[PDB]
Amino acid sequence: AVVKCKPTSPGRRHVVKVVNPELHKGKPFAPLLEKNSKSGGRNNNGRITTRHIGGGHKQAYRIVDFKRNKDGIPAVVERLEYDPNRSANIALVLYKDGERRYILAPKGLKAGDQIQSGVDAAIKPGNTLPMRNIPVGSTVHNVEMKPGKGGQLARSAGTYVQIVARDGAYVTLRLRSGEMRKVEADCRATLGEVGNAEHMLRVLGKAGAARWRGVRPTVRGTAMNVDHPHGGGEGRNFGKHPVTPWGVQTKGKKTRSNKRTDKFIVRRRS
RNA sequence: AGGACCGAACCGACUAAUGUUGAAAAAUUAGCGGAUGACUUGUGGCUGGGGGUGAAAGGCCAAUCAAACCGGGAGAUAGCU
RNA sequence: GCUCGCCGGAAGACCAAGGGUUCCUGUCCAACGUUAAUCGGGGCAGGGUGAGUCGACCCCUAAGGCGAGGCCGAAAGGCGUAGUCGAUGGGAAACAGGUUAAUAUUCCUGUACUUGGUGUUACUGCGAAGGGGGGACGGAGAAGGCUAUGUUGGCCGGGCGACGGUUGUCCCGGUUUAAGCGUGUAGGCUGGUUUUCCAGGCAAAUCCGGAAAAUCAAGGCUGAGGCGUGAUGACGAGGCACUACGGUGCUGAAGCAACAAAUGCCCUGCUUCCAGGAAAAGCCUCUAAGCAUCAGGUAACAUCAAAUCGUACCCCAAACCGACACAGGUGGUCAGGUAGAGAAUACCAAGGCGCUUGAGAGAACUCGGGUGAAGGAACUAGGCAAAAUGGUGCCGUAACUUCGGGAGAAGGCACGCUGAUAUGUAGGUGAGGUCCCUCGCGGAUGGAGCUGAAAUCAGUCGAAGAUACCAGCUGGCUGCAACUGUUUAUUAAAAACACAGCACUGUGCAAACACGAAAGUGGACGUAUACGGUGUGACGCCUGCCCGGUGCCGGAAGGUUAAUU
RNA sequence: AAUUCCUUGUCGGGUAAGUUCCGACCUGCACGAAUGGCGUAAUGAUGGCCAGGCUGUCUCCACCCGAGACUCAGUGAAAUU
RNA sequence: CUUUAAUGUUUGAUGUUCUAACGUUGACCCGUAAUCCGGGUUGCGGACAGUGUCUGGUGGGUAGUUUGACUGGGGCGGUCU
What UniProt keywords apply to this chain's record, in alphabetical order? Predict the structure, then answer.
C-alpha cells in the first residue's frame, strides 16, 4: 500500500513509501545468491562511460529464472521477496521434485498459488506458455525475443504487453512503450502483469534517498564553463540549441541507426 | 522513526586580532558550523595530459594547471630590451 | 635530594605505518645543540633484539592485477578464458609470576594447550579438481543478566602526632592471585524420532531438498558470568642476616563481604526498518571413478616434529611526513578519584614534564588581559570587536503555519547549609532462616544489612546559593534561496552548485549513449513503473499570444544535384 | 524591484533630523510566466533595516597584572648598497 | 531498308520466393571440471545487414589560422589611388 509520512522533519514531508507486508521479513535463499560488485559507471579501461552512478547500498543478485523451462512440473509459491536489483518483487517457488527457484511476481499472486510452464499449462496468471498457444487479445509479461534465451520484455514493476494479432509463425504485440512489434510464435511468455503497480507512486523525498540507490548528483551543463557546449556566459544566457555533451541535439533528434531488424517494427510509437 | 534538536571526540573553516625576512611557503588564539549521515576515517586498488576527475569553482591531478612533470626536437623564433 | 609549578580522555602507557641502532654501558666536548655544558637522539668503542602458541611466512579469497592458448590490432600492443597473484578480510594452539644496565605471552619457574608424522593395540567402508551444509556477515533501537573497575565496611600491620585537641564512630597502608580443566547457569534458537517414496542438487548418493505415514514430547545446539580446581603454590605490606646503602638469601600477617557499575561481554542475540546488507578455503557430511585377508578410516597410548624471517628504540613525536631538536599534520588500543548529564570543564592519583639562552630594570609604543566615575552606539561603511545572556525544575508562551512547527518563543518564580519528617524516607539490592523441590548455579518465603534520591516544614550565614571552571542575548519588518548538504586546498561558503519533485526528448535490447583504430567493456547479469540527455528546481495558485526565422520531426508533385556510365 | 537612467521619483510610516529600510502609487529608461511567474510555514556562520538589553565602540581616556621593547653577559641574521 | 508482334538469347528496373555466401551478444554437444574462443548440430534471419575503396551532404565535436594602417594616446568615426 501507499503511505505518506508525516512532516516531523525537513526530508519527511513529501516522502512516500510503498508498504507491502506480504514480503518475506527474513533472509533470502542463499543457494540462489550471487555477488554483485558495483562499478561506478566505469568500464574495463577505468573511464566513466555512464555518469550519475556511484555508491549506494550493498546488493546481492537473486538468480531469477526468466526462461521457465521446467515444463510439466507444478510449483507452489512459498513467499514473496523484495528484490533490490529490480523494480518488481520476486516469488520463491518450490517444484514437486524439490527444486526451488526465483521468478517475477505477477499482479495478484500470493503464497500457496500453483503455477506451471509448458504447452499444456492452464491459462491463468503466473503460468508460462509459448505465444502460439496464448489466446489473442490477452495480457502477458516476461516475453522472450528469441526462443530459449529468456524473457526480456515487460520485466518492470507494473509492466505488461498485449497480444493483439497472430498471423503465422509470428505474433504482433503492443509493448508498454506503445510500439507495435512482432516476434516468433514460439517464444515463451507468462500470463498476467508484474505486480508492483504502486511502485511508481513512490516519492523519495530527499537527496539521500537517491544516493541509496546509487544515483550520483547530476550537474546541468548550463553552468559548466571548455567542459560542455552550453558552457557558461555572464549570467544565465543559454543562447544555443539544446545539445548533449559530444554535440547531439537531445530535444527531438532520433538516434535509432540499426537498420538490421526493421521488419518486426510496425507502429514504432506515438 | 528522523539527510530531527543541544553538545565533546571527529570532520569542517564564518568573524576578529596576532603573525606577514612568521613558530608555520595559509598557521595560532578567542569564538563559529555539522556532528546516525549526501557522515567521517584507515589499508589497498582503478581512472593519465587536449586526457582524467569534477554536488562545476575553470576547481583538483605530488607546495606547479585556460591544458601536469622529466627528457628530447632545441642554440624554437624574438623586425623587441 | 628537599620544595614549587604544569599535563593527567594527556604533555600518561602499549602498537601499526614510517624510520632504521636513535636502545644500554663506558668514554670524549672540536663540530652539531639557536647560550654554557662535566650533559645529549653528538663523536668513538663495546654490548644488546632468544618464540611450536604474538606477527609475518603459509592455506583461502574481495577490489583489482598479470594472463597459457585465444579474439583484436600498422609494429609496439590491447582485452580476456583456463588459471595465477593480490588484505585492508577468513583460517590450529599460553597464561600468571619472576628475572637483565639494555630482550621476553620469546629466557627461568609453575601449570597448560594445538596441528601434524611415525609406531602399537583395537574396532572398521575408504575414496574428489564433484554434490550439500556450514563458514556467511546491514542499520537503528530496546532493555535485562554479568564483568573489568571503583566505593565503603571488615580483617591484618603499623601509628598516637613540630600548634589547641586526637586510645577513638581516629590516621595511613594493604586486603592480589592467570590461561587451562570440570560444572553448562541467566538467557537465545529449534519440535524431535523412525520407516517408506521421489521428474530435483550436471553422473551417483545413506547427505541436502521434497512428498506421505507412524510414534513421543523432551531432544539437541549455542551460551556471558559465577562456583570449584589450578593454588599446602605464587605474589604480598613488612622483617630477619649480609648490607661497598648498588642490593641480595630467608621469612613474611590479613589476603573477606556488601553496594555501585560500564561505550566492554552474553550480542554474529532479541525487536524493528528499508536503502534489503562480500567471497573462498579450512571445518562437518555425501557419494562417483576406483581399492578391500590390502590401502585407508576411527579411538587410546607411546614417541617425534613444529622449520624460516621479525622482535631493540621513538611512534600525536626532538627519532615518521613538514629543508630545522619547526607552536603544524599522523591511524588503533588501555580509560583511575572528587563534583558533574558526560570521554565536557575544574582540581588530583599512577606516571611523566617544566617546553636548550639567562640576569636585571620596571620609559615610550606594540601584543595578550583585568577594572572603571557620569553617559550608553553619540564610534563606525557597518554595534567590527568587546561587554552581555548562559543552568535545573515549575508556571507561562504571539502573529503565522504545509498543523510537524514557530518554541528553550517571549516572560516570571524558586535554588545554599543544618535539622526534622524518616536515629537514612520512597526506591533499589538482597543474606541468614523457613517452606517446597524434576534435590540444582532451583523456586517460594524471608526481610537482616548495605545503598539511596526528590519533596515538604522549620531554622540559619552571607552583599551575592545555577556562587568557581562550565554554560542560548532576545524581539520586530524584509530581500534571495525551499530545506540537510556541496564549492574556488592557499584573499570569494553565497542569492551559485546539488536536491527531492515537474516536464520535454531519445532509447524495443546486440537499446540509446559512452570509453575504445578494433575486439570488447560499461550502461545491465537491467528491459519503458527501465536507462540516457536537457532544462526547471520543495509545496500551493498557475504557466498566456506567435512556427516568419534557426533547429528538430514528417511528406512529396516538380526542380537542382556526386561518384559512376 | 538583486531589474528604475532621469532619481535622494512622489505620499505616508519610523527618527529632533532617515540618499538606506518598511508600506502604497505606476511614469515598468530596460519585470514577466519551466533560461519559469506570483506567493510560501520552516531553515540560513546569508543581505539590508529598526528596537530592548549590554557595554571603553565613542564622549575622553586613566590605572593595574603579564610577554617584548630598554640595560648586562653569551650566541649571532636579513633585505639593501 | 521505312513497319510490329507470341518467341529465343541479351542485358535494365520492380516485386515475390528459395538457400548455399554472410550474420546470430538463440538452443544443445565436444575440446573442457572454461557464460572466453573455436569446431560440430540445429533453428531463426538472409543475399538484407555489416565491412572495404570511391563519392555528395552534414559537421566548432576536434584542430590549424586570420581578423589592416594612418590616428594630436587607443577605440568609434573618417581616411587610403
Answer: Acetylation, Ribonucleoprotein, Ribosomal protein, RNA-binding, rRNA-binding
Provide, in whole angstroms, the distance separating residue A58's CA from nucleotide C266's C1'. Answer: 29
Asked if the Cβ of residue A10 lies within 7 A of any atom of strand D, the reply is yes
* CATH number for the domain that contains residue A242: 4.10.950.10
**CATH of residue A105:** 2.40.50.140
Q: Determined by which method?
A: cryo-EM
Closest CA to A65 of A139, A23, A128, A135: A128
Q: Number of structural domains, chain A? A: 3
Asked whether residue A140 falls in the same domain as residue A231, the answer is: no
Domain that holds residue A230: 195-270
- Is the CB of A237 within 7 Å of strand D? yes
Resolution in A: 2.5
